[PDB]
Amino acid sequence: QNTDSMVPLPDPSQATKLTSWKNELSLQALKADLDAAKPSHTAMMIKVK
Amino acid sequence: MLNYNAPTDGQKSSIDGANSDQMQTFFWLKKAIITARKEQYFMPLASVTNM
Amino acid sequence: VVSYKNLMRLDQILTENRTPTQTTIITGSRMIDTKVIGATRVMYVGSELVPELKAMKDLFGNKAFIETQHYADAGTIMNGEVGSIDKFRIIQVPEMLHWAGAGAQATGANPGYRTSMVSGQEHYDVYPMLVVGDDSFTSIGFQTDGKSLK
């Protein structure tokens, strides 16, 4: 059983590049946006419940 | 001979008189030096369940 | 001081307790001076312990700390990784805490390990090396009556 749910973050900025864009988003930026947006959504779902 | 001398460290300029001093004696960058948030590792691991 | 057999015992204990693995093995690359890595767990250590981990020797008297520079190719380097030992990949958390003055008293025969003052008496310092397995804990956030949590 291989589960990766506590792995210490994805690769850093210097790793592999999928696209040819000059500036690439990388996974850290996306997960940071998700963790920034989650507190409001968590407060909202209470009313639905 | 009008000499600049050294306005700081107690020596007035020649042009100045009994009651005066250079108004500007230094230059200010106005770009402060600041640190950054120390990185955190354990916080992203945990999920959150509301109460 | 931590030893190789302690790491093997910890692996055996975690295997017996059915703790799921977190990574996959690394087959070698084609570049010269590149060695394979078999390691399936992540362990978080402080900054001060790393030299001792580097000085370790395995059962047959060889090196036991393969640094990230060897297997950076054909692998996925995580944040703060410094190398791999046995089955544990090492993560160097900058903010790793430690109990201060929690060991037995320190006399003048101290080989060189760190100590601290406790009521006018020397005591050694105890440092942690932690492994967080899958689905071990969750955080609780009280509603706060309308605030955007946090």
Dump the DSSP string for C11-54: HHHHHHTTPPB----B---SSSS---B---EEEEE-STTHHHHH
CB pairs under 8 A between B and C: 33
Hey, is C94 helix, strand or coil? coil
Segment 42-81 of chain C within 8 Å of chain A by CB: 42, 44, 76-81
The two beta strands, C139-141 and B48-50, are parallel
Amino acid at the residue B38: K
Cross-strand pairs, C92? C45
Query: Distance between CA C93 and CA B42 in Å, rounded?
Result: 9
How many angstroms from the chain centroid is the CA of residue C66? Answer: 14
Hey, is C4 helix, strand or coil? helix
Question: Who among B41, B44, B48 is closest to A42 (CB)?
Answer: B48
Residue closest to C22 by CA, chosen among C66, C74, C87: C87
Give long-range contacts, CB 8 A cutoff, 24+ apart: C23-30: C23/A2, C23/A4, C23/A7, C23/C89, C24/A2, C26/C71, C26/C74, C26/C75, C27/C74, C28/C71, C28/C74, C29/C71, C29/C73, C29/C74
Hey, is B36 helix, strand or coil? coil
Query: Distance between CA A31 and CA B45 in Å, rounded?
Result: 12
Tokens of B17: 């008189």
Answer yes or no: are the C-beta atoms of B5 and B13 closer than 8 Å. Answer: yes
Answer yes or no: are the C-beta atoms of C35 and A16 closer than 8 Å. Answer: no
Buried/exposed code over C88-99 (b: 16+ C-beta within 10 A; e: otherwise): bbbbbbeebeee
Place of tokens 């989650």: A38
How many angstroms from the chain centroid is the CA of residue B3? Answer: 29
Query: Distance between CA C42 and CA C116 in Å, rounded?
Result: 30
List Cα–Cα distances, B7 to A5, B14, B17, C82, in angstroms.
66, 10, 12, 55
The two beta strands, C66-67 and C81-85, are antiparallel
How many angstroms from the chain centroid is the CA of residue A22? Answer: 21
Residue closest to C10 by CA, chosen among C101, C128, C125: C128
Which helix (H) or strand (E) covers residue C117, if one does? strand C115-118
> Least CA distance to B42: which residue of chain A?
A8
Answer yes or no: are the C-beta atoms of C37 and C71 closer than 8 Å. Answer: yes
Place of tokens 């969750």: C138
Hey, is C88 helix, strand or coil? strand
Touching partners of A (3+ C-beta pairs < 8 Å) = B, C
Residue closest to C41 by CA, chosen among C2, C62, C10: C10
Report the gap between the CA of A46 and the closest CA in chain B (Å).
Answer: 8
End-to-end CA distance of chain C: 40
Query: Which residues in chain B have their CB less than 8 angstroms from residue A38's CB?
Result: 48
